Each structure stands twice: as C-alpha cells, then as structure tokens.
C-alpha cells in the first residue's frame, strides 16, 4: 500500500525546513497568498448561493485555511496547493437543486455524501492508485494541461466582461448637463471604472511578463537582476496598487470577511472525479522536465485528501482537490539556475497560515484593487503553458518550413506527420471544449478516458517516437 | 557657389521617379501625412494667437502645402521635410509683443523682417555654407540629435498632461446621485475621456514598437512579414481607430478646416538661426551610417529655403526650416535589407500634396482620435535615437563590466575614459536643457557654439580615437 510510499518520503523532513531560508522563498509566499485569497473569494461568491450565513466568518476562507495546512506539511511533494475547483462547484449546483425538492435533508445529506465518498476513497487508496505507465504517456497529459490553461485564461477575460457589464459606460458626452441621474432618469449608470480597469489589467500582464524577461537583459547588475526577476509579480501588484491610489477613481477591491443508501450513489460519482482530478494534478507536477526532484508520492496524498474530506464534510466545508494551474505556477517560482527546483515544505504551508489569518489588519488588504488580481491570474495562465511540448508545435503550423526544430533524426523525414499529429491533438481539444460547455463536466473523466482513447488509435500508425515521456532534452552526445 | 552642387544633383531626376513604385513607398506617405497634418494643426493653435482669421482657410495648412511641395521636388536629398519648428514659434511670440506697443506695423513689418532676411540668406548662399569638416565631427551632432529627440519625447507627454488638465476626473463615485451638474453645482467636469486616452496612447506606442520588432520573429511567412513590418505604423493607427469607434466614448479628434532699417536688425537675427537650423537638420540626415546615398546638397537647399521665404513672407505664412525628428523618422522607413536606403523624390512631395488637399472629405479624417496621434509622435521620438552612438554608451553606464562592447583595441585599455567621456557629454546636455527653459532659444546656436566649444576642450586629452565620423561599423578584416 502507501507504506512503500511513506517509507521514502519520511527521510526528508529535516532536510526541507533548513532548505527554506532563501530570499526567493519569500517571493513565492506573498505571491501565491495573493493568488489563493483571490481564488478563495472568487468561489465564495459562487458557492454563496447555497450556504448563506452559517457562521460569523465566511466558510470558504476557513475551509481552505486548514485543508492546505494539514496537507502541505508533507504529502508527497506538497508543492501542490489545495483549493476549490470547477467540477465540484457545478456539482453542488446540481445537488442543491436535487435537494431543492425537499428530500428531508440538505446539509446533513451532504454529510453522507461526503462520508461514504471518503470511505470509497479509503478503499481506492488500499487497492491501487497507479495509472501512470500505460495511460498518461506524454500525450493527453499535456493535452489536459494545455486545455485547463485555456479555460483559466478564458476565465480571466470572462470575469471582466462581467465586470464591464456591472459598470456600464454612458458613451454620450462632451455636451455637459444633459445626463443628470435624478428612482431617477437617464443617468443611473456609472462612469470611468471599467476604462480604468483595463489599464490595470493589461498593464500588470504586460508588466509582469516584462520583468520575467528582464532576467536576460544586461542593463542592470546580475545579483540584483535575479532579485528583481523573482520579486517580479508582487511589486507589479504594488506598482499598479499605487497607480490606483494616485488616480482618485475607485474600482472593485478585495473585501475579505433511506437517506443513507440514497446518498451512496452520488458518493459513487464524486469519488470518481476527486480521484481522477488528483492524478492529473499530480502527473503534470511530477514532470521529469522538472529535474532532480526528491520523491513522488501518489498514494498518501490520496490518503491525505480522504482525511481532510471528513473534517470538511463534518463542518460544512467545500471539498478541496489539488490545483492544476496554481501548482505549475507555484513551482515556476521555486527554481534555481536549469539545475533542479526545490523541496520547500513551509512555502507550501505558510500560504495557508497567512490565508488562515483572515483579517491580518484587513484594511492592509482592502486597498488592493480587484482587477489587478485578474491580471496575475492571466499571467499564471499564460506562464502555465510555457514548457509544454504541445505549444512548441502548435506554433509550428505558423512557422514556415526553412527553419530549425529541436529534435533530430526521427521526424525530419516525416515532416508532414508532425502537422498531422498535432492537428489530431488540436482536434480532440475542440471535442473537450464543447463538451465542457454542456453539462458533461460533472462526469469529469469522460473527457479524459475518451481523451486517452485516441492514444490507442495512434498505435495503428507507429514508428520510432520521441513523442514519449521522461525524455525532454536529449543532447545525444 | 551652388553651381558645383547643382551639377551633381542634376543627373538623377529621371532615376528617382522610376524608383518610386515599390509597396513600402506607399507606407511612408500615409504615415508621414498623418505626422505632418498633426504637426501642422498642433502649431496652428499656437501660432493662432497672432494671425486669427485672415482667410477662409487656416493658413498653416496652405503654408506647409506649397513650401514642402516646391522644396521636395529636388533640393539636395529632399528626404527631409519642411515644417514649422520650436525657435521660430517663440520668436514670433516675442515679435508680436515687440510690435504690441504699436510700431505702426505688424504684418507688413514682418515683410521687411522676412525680405531682408532672405537677402541675407542669399548672401550666405553666395559666400559659403560649409561648416562640416571642422565643427560637426561626430560629437555635438549626435549631441544635438540626442537632445532634440529628448525634447520631442518630452513634448509628447506634455501635450497630454495638458489634455488631462482639460478633461478632469471627478474621482468620487460608487454612491450614485450626488454629482448632478446643474451655471450649476459640483459636477461641471467631464468623466472618462482621459482614462480612455492613456489606453490609446500607451497602446499605440506598445503596438507600433511591437510590429517593428515583429520583423525578426519567425512565427509568420517572410514575404508577408516584410509587408507587415512596414505597414506597421499606419494600421496601428487603424487598430486603435476602431477601438475608439467600438468603445462609445469620444475623445479629442482631428478637425482640419524708419520701418525698413529698424527691421534690418531682427532680420540679422533670424537669418542666423534659420541658417544654423538647416545644417544640423542636414548633417544628421547625411549620416554616413545611412549607406550608399546618391548626393549631398548643402547650398541649393539653403538657396531653396530663401526662395520660399519671400513667398511665405508675402502671403503671411510662417517660416519653414527643415525638420530634425521627422526626417530621421522619414528615412527610417525608406530602407531595404542594411544595403542602402533610397532616393525617392515623390514620397517626400506627395505628402505635401495630400496635405494640400485640405478637406479630402474631412469626415474621412474627422474620426481619427487626437491621442492616437500623440502616440505616433512618441514612436518617432524613441525611434529617432535608435542608431545614435551616444545612446549605445549612455546605456553602458548601467552595464556591468564583464560584458561585450563593439569596437576593439583603442579604448579597451582606457575603459575608464569611456565613462569619463560620456559623462562629459551628459554634462553639456544639462546646460542646454536648462538654457532651453529660459528665453535663450531665440538665440539658438548659442547652445550649439558653446556645445561645439567643449569639442575643442577634448583636444587637451587626446589619443587615438574611434570617436569620429564617417566610420560606424568597421570589420577590420
């Protein structure tokens, strides 16, 4: 079982905490704190349909406070961050309407939804959770990484067109006094927030992507160039924090404070997706490209999420599976120069402690504008697909032929097969995009099992292949 | 005289017009048309203090219509563009106040100001106009090129802080009906133009500088990449033209339609600066870096500006000396790949014909926003100091030492002298900056003769020098 997994993760606990005093370890904490407290508040409104008051503190903060805290001590590379996700949210919209017809119970119904689903998860940690060596082999693991990035980028722009529809421009001026507002007439709609917002938003993407490319620019000293190429995101929030302060217009800103066996069959459903989400939020984090790691825990974290599932279910707290875009944005920061990454254990868990400090003099977090935080979402989206192999060939359709690729000797004669392979890979994303639009994400791995099905169709046209995992840069000499 | 100069410029007239059918020759016309009709309208307001009605057409358009037209047929590399400039404008503020105490004559006084100044210019074309080989030798000709660029960039930002002070933000909202405007109360000041304006302005600089750097990016076909890297500026105006159209807020936009001998001594003054402006707006355009040119006319253009001086003086039209930033932005466009530039004669003179077409269905030029045209000023400012030598060393103070310079063997042992030389060159710009602030630009070459004076002070610390002209890239092998 997980005893063979906990045996190799055990002799590293003292080696990690004394590896966490570096300066850039401070960078990733207050960055991802700003990401997580944004990702907490942006789902607290969406989940705020069902669970309305229930406490003198909003439960989505205290939920993600303890759930990552007990996780990211050590959980089999705890570089991953637990938070809430897409499919669990849309399921609870369904389950609230499935319990809107008064099946005697709603929240206590969710208990026996949550309790037996952990029990099914405790059977799955006992039997086997290992699908790596024949299912997720370098196709449809970028093919999901490069699709959940495209949703998270598209979720960024959607959260501002909703902002633009909440702050509508009058678009009729230069005359003067004809747009008085007053239960009034003709002018009950705001000016000049949304035009300010796209300055901050497009700025802090163009700022943050500039200071990361600043690392190669020679026009500053090197040992300070590394210090600015790692504090890049946080002061890009600070620069546009005070530009919001100088320009006296406001904006949205952060503001922080028979029953049982019928509950078996939806617990049969949620233990599928929470299981299936955990692997693909792990196999992209494992990622042999991220060189010189110090362990790979697949069972105990899946055992860890079952432990926190019953304490979240008992206290009416939302179920929390590992992240996919924030974790690959986490471990972007924690790396030297390639020469390995890290194994920092406190940076993964200080971010939940500072999340646990709910107020932390909340006026110090009140004058951060909300649209600058959508920009650092769009930076984490675009930078999440940096090192994937699939983008290096989707930008090869547009690349004319008399140019240089990377790998040698095995696809230089089938040049046309490259253009055929990625077009097949682009083709399956369009299926998964439009099935995400309908109600088919609650059955979540059906866009993964059908996604890995065409990997078996690839076996009918076979040759030598460097289209396989554990092999990213090969010098051959 | 100029007979030896007109003798070599004569055997090229038929060679130029048949050299003007290329596609990128169309690019530079409608770009610089948009620059010149902006530079006409932006001085027509400033000169609009004195000459108020005087015609059913604004005289600043028809002024720059004919004055570049008869010039840029052929005038000794007519790549330069005539327009109005700084020092002539501030002189006419002085002369209007010098004639505000009713010295019997204002406009007809300017006749005998203009007429004898041309007569003094006709003596100076007869005697000698050749100061090259001992005064403007690669120091203080970048030293003026890299200073008039810094004024033109600083003039761009100043024209929007004036725009921001004309459209002031209320900066007090989210409540609602407390800011009614009504001879009213508390709300007689506009919203949401100036926040729109900095989107267009910073955008069309970041857009235009991106599409010029697009030329090296492989992710598009090459023979279309050259077509987009030369239409870069004009459609960057078009892209942000329609973004202004979609976003329904307006902005400022383009909207086009005893006496004699006392007049000797100011005509003694203006024939200094108009003479002195012409050389430094020519020696930066001559520029042996711009390889493989086909002539160098120094006398006949100075004879040409005297011809148009009397027709401008007779019709009450402003005096028009050659440009310094637009001309180096002109000949940026007209170049192949380095491999020479051009000798196009119609592109320099079609731009005044289209300027001469004043209306040209002026509603087709009415919905171009004025703040996108300040952006293409700031692009022409920053790109004017591209190839200067002085910026390549002012960005060497910030460059730490274990790095690569360009030239070999003569300043690699005096590394410290490089840091001393440019600091001396930075020092004289600060003198010229603060003397430009006071009333010392009307005596304009006193910041040039004192500028070339420290070139003689350089002779006391002499060695071998590659700090000299006609020598820019040297392979030495």
Residue numbers in the entry:
A (entry chain A), B (entry chain B): 401 to 582, 638 to 712, 735 to 814, 826 to 965
What text does the study give?
Among the SLC4 transporters, Na+-dependent members function as either symporters or exchangers that mediate their specific physiologic roles in different cell types by thermodynamically coupling the transport of Na+ to base (HCO3− or CO32−) with or without simultaneous Cl− transport. To further improve our general understanding of these transporters, we investigated the structural and functional properties of human NBCe1, a Na+-coupled SLC4 symporter, using cryo electron microscopy (cryoEM) and functional mutagenesis studies. The transporter is a member of the anion exchanger family belonging to the APC superfamily, the second largest secondary carrier superfamily. The 3.9 Å structure of NBCe1 provides a common framework for the Na+-coupled SLC4 transporters that underlies their functional properties.
